[PDB]
Amino acid sequence: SVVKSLNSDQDDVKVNIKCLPTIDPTKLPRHEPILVTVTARLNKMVSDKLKGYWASNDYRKQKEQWQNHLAQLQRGLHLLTDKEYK
Amino acid sequence: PEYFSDALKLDAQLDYSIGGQDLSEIFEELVKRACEILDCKAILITFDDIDTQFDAGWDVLESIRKFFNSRKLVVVATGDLRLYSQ
Amino acid sequence: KIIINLFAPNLPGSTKEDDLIQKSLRDQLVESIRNSIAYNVFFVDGTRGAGKTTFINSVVKSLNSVNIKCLPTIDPTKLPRHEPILVTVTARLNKMVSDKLKGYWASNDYRKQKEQWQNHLAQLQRGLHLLTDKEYKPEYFSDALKLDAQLDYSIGGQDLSEIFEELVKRACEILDCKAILITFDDIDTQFDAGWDVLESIRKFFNSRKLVVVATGDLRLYSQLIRGKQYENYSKTLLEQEKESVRLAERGYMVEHLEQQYLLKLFPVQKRIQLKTMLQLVGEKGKAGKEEIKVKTEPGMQDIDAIDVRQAIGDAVREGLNLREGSDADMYVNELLKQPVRLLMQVLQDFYTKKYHATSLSVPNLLRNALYGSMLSSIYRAGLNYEQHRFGMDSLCKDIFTYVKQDRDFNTGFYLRPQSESEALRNCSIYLASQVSENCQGSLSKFLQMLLVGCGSVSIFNQFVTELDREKFEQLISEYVAYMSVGRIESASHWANRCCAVVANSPNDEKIGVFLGMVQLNRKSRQHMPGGYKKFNIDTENGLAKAAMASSLSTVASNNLMDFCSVFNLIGAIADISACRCERSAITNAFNKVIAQTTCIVPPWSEAQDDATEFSDAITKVEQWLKNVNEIEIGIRPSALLIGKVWSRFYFNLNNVADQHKTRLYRNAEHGRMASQSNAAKIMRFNVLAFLHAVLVEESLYHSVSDREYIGEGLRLNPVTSVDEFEKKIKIIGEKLKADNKTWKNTHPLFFLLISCPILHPFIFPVGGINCSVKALNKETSFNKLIDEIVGDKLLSDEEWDYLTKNQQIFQNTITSLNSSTIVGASYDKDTPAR
Amino acid sequence: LIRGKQYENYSKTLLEQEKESVRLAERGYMVEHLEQQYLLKLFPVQKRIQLKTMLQLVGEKGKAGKEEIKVKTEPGMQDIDAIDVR
Amino acid sequence: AGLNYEQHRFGMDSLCKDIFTYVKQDRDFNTGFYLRPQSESEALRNCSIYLASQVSENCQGSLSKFLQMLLVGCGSVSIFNQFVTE
Amino acid sequence: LARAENDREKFEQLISEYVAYMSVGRIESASHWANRCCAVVANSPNDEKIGVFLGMVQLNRKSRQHMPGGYKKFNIDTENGLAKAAMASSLSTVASNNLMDFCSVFNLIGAIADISACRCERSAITNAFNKVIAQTTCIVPPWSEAAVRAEMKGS
RNA sequence: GUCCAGCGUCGCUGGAC
């Protein structure tokens, strides 16, 4: 109920809340870090909104920068689940 | 981490609202397609008893909880509660 | 000057220079650090939530304003489970050097220092495999013997302890600082992570250019280091030698090794201790060396900030309905000893919910704060936890569990915080708040705890506990299931079952009088000495019959015993004064249990117009109820009050059942001598002991009042006579006359009880009156004073004169109760003459 | 979960040597103190919300509840002649 | 709660056990035949209401059906309490 | 009351109660200390059941019936000025089941301690001396067999 | 000095005259 009252705002005030889809730890596939699931669901909202732009110059600038941060995270994701240092 | 990039993938198939793999939704649309080919409202999955084992039941119980959730499936289990409760 | 507002995030990364608590300590340590470098490990310790992260963040910010450069603060908890500390420190040191290296201006210096620094950094990378290794691979022996002529390596081998020594020297030259400061954090979340930090400190960080500050608590490091010394013993030896003489000697070598290892790492003359809030603000009387004030509502300008101790008290005196005094100072002094993470946690919830509520039932705000804050302690105590079941049923069962785990029954039901276990010092203050809320602004609920909540504790401790820790728990599982502490129906039904338990224990010389009750004969005995006869219910006419037919009991033993209990009288008051609506309900409470319920023996038992009969009586209750419904709002009970009145009502009632047991002479009927005693005299004191108990404590511990009107004197108990009871009433009445204070407002609980129509017939029964020249002076004075307090004449002068000096029907006095005989008593003996 | 994970954070050998029933006294005490502080840090008390059943809103006799709930039983009555929830 | 959860096949004889099998679980034989929900468990406070509904339906509009349930179902909880103690 | 080797947790717990009741380590006045030690001495009356003790003798607060000699109640006011100054300091009261009076040399030692101070002045001595000659009551220790009845009656 | 009262199990304490 509070999700539908925050993702369906009338754009009344500048401060805004964007709600990710509900995450269920039980139904989530095991041996998968929560941080990975959150980023995957966060990607869909940003990627779909990136597709929704109208200014071609703005879309190309953000896509280059946003895709750069994801490539930085995956390099460090090895450090999250390891059994030894190297 | 080699499969992290695969989860963060945009698809033209149904434009999956939930990111990542999420095998629950992948199997869900498979049943919808099978109903169109078979021309039926729903498909029933019927399981037999586990009355001689205590490991066949656990995989049956877990699969029903996670995957077989759509309205196109009706499941008819079989057994006695004493084994399942234990 | 410290002002702590309650409307901020208050996180360690959200505090300003003014919100800091340990300002004096911070300035001492920072000065102390610079002394050591100019002319080597520090330590700041304290309990959990004492302000560890906040304090260490204050130090690092202050140093950035001899030059000492400080690395960003690190903690072992928020790190990879396998990453060595040396890698983490080096990586942060690289970032600081690189930024300063880009800030140079001379091309020659920057183009030369960078390779000199990079050469050292690349050398440490080669020897890193020596730390994360599993087994010595001998192919590195060849590469460990190529001793370079440069870098001036005094000792051969890899000697990684010296590679860091050279590295830090080069980094200090680039940054142009005399020393480098490293800050760690607490290992409270991750206990195991502290071992790697400790071992690295003693091995690598031994340079003169480094200073280290560590935060935690020595109570946890000791239990970690000592846990690591046992692995140094062979497993086979630990399992073979098991005799206690060797285990004791071995159990001391570990302890001594632990102290020496810790003492060589953190020097004692370097440690700093974080004082909790109690030591800063000081005591109530002895003003401390520093003061702390807080904000309460938004918009409060800094001038009118109240003291923290006063702020806690205003949430305790009003929250628990407890008068200001020594007891109030005890609760606040206990709350200060709590960790700062929890002290500031209750305040941010009570006051915030207070502002929005005001934009009341203040104890409802306090309970919701303490219950959430102390929540973990309730689960350990086994107490109740559910949210939509609060009420009478839970608290009566709830109060029995806390005393059960405290191993106390005498003072247990006072809900004092004077226990010894921490898990029970958090469930006492919360319980004191739970009762203060629930029995507030009502009289039916106030009498239920006094009869059930604070009563069931003492009954078990005196009549059932004299029957093996599994049997003691077996006994408890039966007493609860019989008395029905939970699943209770009514205070009247509780008294009937309580009558069976109290009557099970034997009495000396088989005399049928017990604690707060009298047993009357059911059959008739031939050749009765005197005018005694069988008790009959068809004697009293009106209110005398109503106020006495509601104080009976009936058990279902081999033969039925017909009891008569003052406890059953108390249940009728709380049952009647419950529903304000209708009028037929008053009739039901008089005859709801009398001839409908059978109470079987405990399982551990070793052995005229009918309408006008009560129409005058029923009305009297109705006009009395309107007085209750208009004044009961102003009463403010408390945990102390409902417990203290029960102590006086118990010991006083104990003496009555004992002293009046040897005075059953054959001249008891119509007896009015002091040494004489009968059923009427005994019960005249039981219901008067209850009234006396409420009067004494109300002037002592009650919120609505401001001080005590008893005055200096000795508080006694009317066990055999009533000489001093009105002496109290007369003395108190004088005080309110001088102070121009009305009687009803100052003592609301006493007023609604002394005016109760039900107790009026039992104040002056027939046999209870004493005839003597001195006794009549006190008895007459007693009658006069009660006339003024109630405002209605109890008994008329024409009727009164008959009772005192040797027919006539009565409507406000029991007539033939003294003539009734106690079963199990023989009246062969007569009254001694003296 | 938190209390259990605190016990798994001890040296196993120490838990077998020091069990003289007086050393164990501060073993249980120290775990609860660590566990209690852990819960407050994660979920502050002033950020907890509890659902309210309809009884604590309105229904108790003699008290004017802060809210009023109106229920209409017969089909198609007006929003003014409906009967109270109690 | 182990009562008779049958949708149909109802009668007075099946009701007698329901009264008796409920008081035994509540372990209160003095006031078991009142069916007033005063228990401390939520699983039983929701079954007394169902039982109190069946006694009204079965005994409404008859005399033999009234004496039989009182004599048999209601009395057995009291007589048995005279021989449990021994 | 409880030996050491019988219980090493009951013995230590007694020390925790003893320091709080006896106010050692947080003292405020030497005289108050001497008033407290009077009560703890009487907690174990000798088998002979006499009012004489280690350093104190218990006077009788209420006159008895038959005195074989010329004996009477104490009657504090009978003495003279200087005598009353010393005697009033000696006098002490302990709140028990029934009030009892005590006179111990410890109070005299405590009396000298409070008087002995620097910066002597006429007003300072007058107020301090008047504080020395005062009547104070001390509750029995919490470990006494009658630590609850003396709480009901009050001072 | 005397009467009344209360705590302990005779002793003990309060009040009045």
Ligand SMILES: Nc1ncnc2c1ncn2[C@@H]1O[C@H](COP(=O)(O)OP(=O)(O)OP(=O)(O)O)[C@@H](O)[C@H]1O
């Ligand atoms: N000086 C202070 N002024 C105001 N609030 C303070 C102060 N010190 C501590 N607090 C309060 O106490 C808590 C801070 O505790 P802190 O995080 O420092 O303790 P810790 O448990 O040792 O640290 P860590 O979070 O690293 O485990 C917060 O709730 C904060 O509001």
